[PDB]
Write a protein that binds this ligand. Sequence first.
Ligand SMILES: OC[C@H]1O[C@@H](O[C@H]2[C@H](O)[C@@H](O)[C@H](O)O[C@@H]2CO)[C@H](O)[C@@H](O)[C@H]1O
Ligand SMILES: OC[C@H]1O[C@@H](O[C@H]2[C@H](O)[C@@H](O)[C@H](O)O[C@@H]2CO)[C@H](O)[C@@H](O)[C@H]1O
Lengths: 138, 138
Amino acid sequence: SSLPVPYKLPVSLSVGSCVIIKGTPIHSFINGPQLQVDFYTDMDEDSDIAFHFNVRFGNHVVMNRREFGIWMLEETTDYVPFEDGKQFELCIYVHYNEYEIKVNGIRIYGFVHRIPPSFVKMVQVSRDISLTSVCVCN
Amino acid sequence: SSLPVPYKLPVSLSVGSCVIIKGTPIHSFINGPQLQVDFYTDMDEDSDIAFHFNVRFGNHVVMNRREFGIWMLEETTDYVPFEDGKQFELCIYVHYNEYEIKVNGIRIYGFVHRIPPSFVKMVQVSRDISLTSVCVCN
Ligand SMILES: OC[C@H]1O[C@@H](O[C@H]2[C@H](O)[C@@H](O)[C@H](O)O[C@@H]2CO)[C@H](O)[C@@H](O)[C@H]1O
Ligand SMILES: OC[C@H]1O[C@@H](O[C@H]2[C@H](O)[C@@H](O)[C@H](O)O[C@@H]2CO)[C@H](O)[C@@H](O)[C@H]1O
């Protein structure tokens, strides 16, 4: 891996920001690897989470937020167009109303803001991947 | 312009970070356009500057830092491989000892750190350009 995992990146996000994560699962899909991305409101990992994204590769995605320390109503999709063994590109685009999530150029979900994305101060990329690059673009 | 100018971007920089700025001068070179990039230590524009970069297109580049509110010893180079009228790509790579400055893929300078780049909290892109994108990569 080019970057350490878990990777904690201090960020400032605004409408129009894009978070681009490139990496490779470290296990084949029959071994149940996961990839997790958390949009934290502080560097402290017990702070609130505006957007939590966990992919069980070959299975499904779970998304949520944590508000006042409490996990809210979980959202899911079974659309996980990742390829076994290959590098992926995960793009999270900050729109005025939602985070748009794209996997290898394919839009899979739009997670609507329940707090403004300007409250996000750290992005954590974790679990069973090797990281090639993380970019934040405007 | 896709982004407002002056563009003030809150950033966190570490060794291995790359700041990629894409834009176009808004005047032809005979009209003396400039492009300026400041690596500020705070959002306040009177805070100290770890790295100041000002290109007089078709002319030369001036670089400096501002410490305790005082401009230090100015550095210059006449290597300014920008093209009149065209989009440029300006890459600033944070190495352990220096910022490496590339213009359209060409390394033109290495400005050595006099404070650690982790002290940079805002990047300001200013003067006579239209901005297409600013990316911070690791
Ligand atoms: O919702 C994401 C969030 O939930 C926790 O796991 C849930 C689990 O998804 C649910 O099926 C079960 O009923 O309650 C669990 C709460 O412990 C995770 O622990 C957390 O990491 C998040 O992934
Ligand atoms: O060194 C960059 C810094 O200097 C100021 O301009 C200098 C100028 O470059 C120098 O030739 C003259 O002798 O002193 C000036 C100080 O006022 C700029 O004002 C500042 O914006 C920076 O560009």
